[PDB]
Amino acid sequence: TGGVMKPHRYRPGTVALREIRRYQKSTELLIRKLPFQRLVREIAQDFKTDLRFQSAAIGALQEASEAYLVGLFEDTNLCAIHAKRVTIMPKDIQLARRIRGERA
Template sequence: MVRVKQINGKQKLEDTIQEKILKAKKDKYESKTSVDKSKKLYRKRGNFVLDEIRHYQLVTENLILKKPFQRLVKEILINVQAENARPLYRMSCAAVCILQDMAESYLTDLMNDGVICALHANRITIFPKDFDLVLRLSPNY
């Protein structure tokens, strides 16, 4: 049974036909533009890595998590205390944060110089020998 509009008691069949045509066109367009959620979107190789690089270039927060870094610092302090047999060392939260910032900046500078050494050798992959070369050549490290 076809639904028809009644305006002032008169049926307008042509309005409903036009509405059906518009709805069919709209459904056809939506089916083309919508993506199946079951299908995985295909991305070109390397795009994800480039997106990660762009993201981490904009991020200003620390990349190393705070708790694991604090545990590492505590472990190093315990080892130093065991060697020296001195009283307990304590570190404030601000000191650990500053130490974390400096460690991250050191590592990023070392990585950048390692990438430059790899590119100089016409390679893309970074090898341990690149870091050895960086540590040997620069007095900053």
């Protein structure tokens, strides 16, 4: 009789609310540097090649993309809350972009 009682798992939302507080308190970059840099180079390749990208330009692009995505997710959370849901769906993303004017 040497068995061990298990601590079970957390409820859905508890670790979510914890990590919400943790990411809203801290300020580090959430997108990995090298895959984002490769993605930026892939997008820039389509117009004209042999285009070198300074580290500061890549960092500014990353900061702008993170700010845009955070604002869009705040608006999409407001959309989901308005529809009596707690889970965001792509339809809220499309509606937020529509009302913001980014999507025609």
